[PDB]
Design a protein around this ligand. Structure first.
Ligand SMILES: O=C(CO)[C@H](O)[C@H](O)COP(=O)(O)O
Ligand SMILES: O=C(CO)[C@H](O)[C@H](O)COP(=O)(O)O
Lengths: 196, 196
């Protein structure tokens, strides 16, 4: 009565919807908004920033990050050097620009020289094996996109309360999901699905 | 009737208030919230994140960044590798943690080893000479802290509209300043003050 079955969640994700993702069923877990990188629009990025910490990250597989020449920031959340997609962006930080950069990171046709570094988007490197190797939200994002038949790239950010800026625990996430019509799932639920 | 005189603005800044900073008087400029790094509290960081892009940056002088061993992210906005103050933080992204890290970056007693890299705060390197060399918001932040007799460190983020996520131009910034009791100034105005 709280979490959406994975297969229904995958269709919503496939249809460009966000999913609220928790680690497991614990009430003290803090929620994250996650959606397909290739499907995030200016409006959806505006939504993500409005209700989150604003430290928007874009999980990519290590193979894809290597292809785009996005090395670890430092030669626990594997940040790569930040970036902006050059063509079509100005300030880089706008909802329009961050959305374009995110879709560009997912686009199979994008090339290393298409991006400016540093930038305003934080790409993350998901480990090979995804959730079977590391149960992080980074691996969850790429796993969701993979299961959805989309490019192995996602975009995420932490939900925050408007009242005091505290991260949203399960109860508030359930309220947020009902108010905005967003389904909720948890990583353990996802691991169970891909394991049997 | 729009911009606050610099000396009055400095007293507000010295008193831990934010200042809305524009490049000059143009109505098309987008506004930034800027305040002293050493004075940002959990509540003030929550406020900043709530009404901004969330990509919170911490302007520091190049000399201070060198002392803290925060090299340029890559060898335009001069980002250094990101960081979190180790002691007292957990998730690093929380208003509490980002505020603590920010105050720590300003604290002259902080040491290189006190921080974990990468992190959730984006330090910026202000060029020597500040606003007389580069009229960026980075230099403006450090300049304000310097003129206020505080540590050469500031914290900033771009104001964004709740309705559509678009950055706040002058008109909206004036409305924001009046609604929240925050003074507005512009960089050209600051350059005039430090010159002559
Ligand atoms: O979701 C998050 C924190 O909860 C953030 O997006 C983080 O940058 C990536 O998460 P993780 O380190 O679990 O892969
Ligand atoms: O203020 C800003 C947007 O304008 C940002 O905080 C930026 O990181 C610093 O700006 P600048 O490159 O002008 O020093």
């Amino acid at each position: 009565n709280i979490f959406t079955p994975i297969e229904e969640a995958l269709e919503a994700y496939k249809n460009g919807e966000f999913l609220i993702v928790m680690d497991d069923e614990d009430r003290e877990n803090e929620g994250d908004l996650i959606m397909a990188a290739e499907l995030i629009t200016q409006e959806k990025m505006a939504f993500l920033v409005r209700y989150s910490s604003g430290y928007v990250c874009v999980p990519l597989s290590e193979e894809r990050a290597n292809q785009l020449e996005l090395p670890p920031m430092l030669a626990g959340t594997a940040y790569t050097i930040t970036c902006d997609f050059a063509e079509g962006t100005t300030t880089g930080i706008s909802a329009h620009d961050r959305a374009l950069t995110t879709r560009s990171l997912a686009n199979p046709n994008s090339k290393p020289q298409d991006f400016i570094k540093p930038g305003h988007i934080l790409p993350l490197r998901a480990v090979p094996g995804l959730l079977k190797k590391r149960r992080g939200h980074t691996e969850a994002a790429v796993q969701l996109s993979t299961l959805a038949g989309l490019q192995p790239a996602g975009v995420i950010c932490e939900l925050v309360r408007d009242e005091d800026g505290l991260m949203m625990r399960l109860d508030d996430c359930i309220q947020f999901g009902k108010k905005h019509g967003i389904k909720i799932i948890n990583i353990n639920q996802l691991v169970e699905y891909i394991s049997k």
